[PDB]
Amino acid sequence: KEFLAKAKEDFLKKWETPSQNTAQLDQFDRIKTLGTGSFGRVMLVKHKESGNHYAMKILDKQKVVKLKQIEHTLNEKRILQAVNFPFLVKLEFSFKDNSNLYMVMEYVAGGEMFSHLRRIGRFSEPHARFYAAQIVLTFEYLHSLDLIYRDLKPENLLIDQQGYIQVTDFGFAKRVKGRTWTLCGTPEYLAPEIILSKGYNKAVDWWALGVLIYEMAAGYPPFFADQPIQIYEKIVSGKVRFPSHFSSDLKDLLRNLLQVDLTKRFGNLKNGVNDIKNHKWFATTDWIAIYQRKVEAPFIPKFKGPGDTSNFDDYEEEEIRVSINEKCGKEFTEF
Numbered sequence: 594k595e596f597l598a599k600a601k602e603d604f605l606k607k608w609e610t611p612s613q614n615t616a617q618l619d620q621f622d623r624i625k626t627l628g629t630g631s632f633g634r635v636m637l638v639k640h641k642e643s644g645n646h647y648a649m650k651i652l653d654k655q656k657v658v659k660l661k662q663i664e665h666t667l668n669e670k671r672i673l674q675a676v677n678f679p680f681l682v683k684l685e686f687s688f689k690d691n692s693n694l695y696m697v698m699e700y701v702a703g704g705e706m707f708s709h710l711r712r713i714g715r716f717s718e719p720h721a722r723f724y725a726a727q728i729v730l731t732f733e734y735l736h737s738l739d740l741i742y743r744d745l746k747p748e749n750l751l752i753d754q755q756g757y758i759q760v761t762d763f764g765f766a767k768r769v770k771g772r773t774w775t776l777c778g779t780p781e782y783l784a785p786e787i788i789l790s791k792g793y794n795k796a797v798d799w800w801a802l803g804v805l806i807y808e809m810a811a812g813y814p815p816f817f818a819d820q821p822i823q824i825y826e827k828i829v830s831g832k833v834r835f836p837s838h839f840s841s842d843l844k845d846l847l848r849n850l851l852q853v854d855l856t857k858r859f860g861n862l863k864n865g866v867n868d869i870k871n872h873k874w875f876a877t878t879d880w881i882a883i884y885q886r887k888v889e890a891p892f893i894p895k896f897k898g899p900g901d902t903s904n905f906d907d908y909e910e911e912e913i914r915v916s917i918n919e920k921c922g923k924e925f926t927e928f
């Protein structure tokens with residue numbers, strides 16, 4: 594398309610020359626912890642000079658050097674300043690201190706899809722389709738840019754003010770023309786080729802689309818157990834049991850998305866994304882009106898004024914420590 598060609602040129606310019614050091618800590622007021630992760634936490638901040646709320650992600654340089662995840666961390670930031678899609682959380686600023694790595698993202702007050710799916714129980718198939726349509730389109734954009742996302746799950750999906758999805762957590766995202774090999778992602782969502790330690794491609798993302806749709810519509814993942822090892826055993830056999838309330842259409846899309854044989858899975862066939870887009874479970878979806886956000890969202894989060902954290906959890910509020918000494922400069926010089 595003309596747009597996918599435009600998406601390539603804008604991605605590439607930014608990917609070739611990253612925005613670096615576009616803000617600093619003392620321009621932001623610290624308010625509350627919105628989430629924590631492997632290398633830090635995401636905190637609601639308020640821009641002092643504009644008054645805008647942002648979600649500032651803080652990763653401690655020392656812990657990512659120590660857990661060896663420096664290339665993935667650099668990958669996350671470089672992909673984020675270089676992408677631009679309506680269903681992606683926008684990275685507004687980036688900088689580093691002595692101890693940390695900061696990414697301030699737009700505040701998406703509706704919180705994680707996870708909360709809402711657990712609170713509502715299961716989403717109706719229109720509601721699930723509404724969300725899945727956004728991901729299919731997001732994944733078409735990211736795969737065109739030769740980016741594999743690699744961590745689709747409802748915790749990494751935020752619901753905005755309009756009830757539209759905003760994808761976050763690009764910590765495992767990667768620029769891959771072809772196959773890649775890292776044991777990345779989340780157990781319930783890992784495609785059989787990741788589990789079987791193969792050189793996998795963009796189709797792991799499409800398998801994880803099948804885990805999300807089944808989970809959004811059943812209210813629970815297709816492959817669950819207590820041990821990771823037992824979840825894995827279920828995924829490589831890949832025999833899915835569907836809920837009776839699932840339509841025939843839904844069961845058919847999910848059998849083709851949750852196809853263990855990678856060369857037979859939707860999104861990875863010769864017709865590509867069109868086998869999903871043209872599936873009868875998406876027969877009533879106007880793909881451009883989803884993109885243009887002209888479809889009435891089936892759920893709009895109860896939003897107040899900006900800075901309401903109602904839709905996120907309470908975490909222990911720790912001190913944001915920035916050392917006198919500059920730790921891990923060399924490792925993180927491209928950041």
Ligand SMILES: O=C(N[C@@H]1CNCCC[C@H]1OC(=O)c1ccc(O)cc1)c1ccc(O)cc1
Nearest residue numbers: 628629630631632633634635648699700701748
């Ligand atoms: O990325 C966001 N939150 C994610 C929601 N996904 C599940 C919890 C992880 C959390 O991000 C982290 O807290 C986090 C993740 C990894 C890491 O290394 C450090 C922090 C996020 C982004 C923008 C927002 O407006 C609001 C939240």
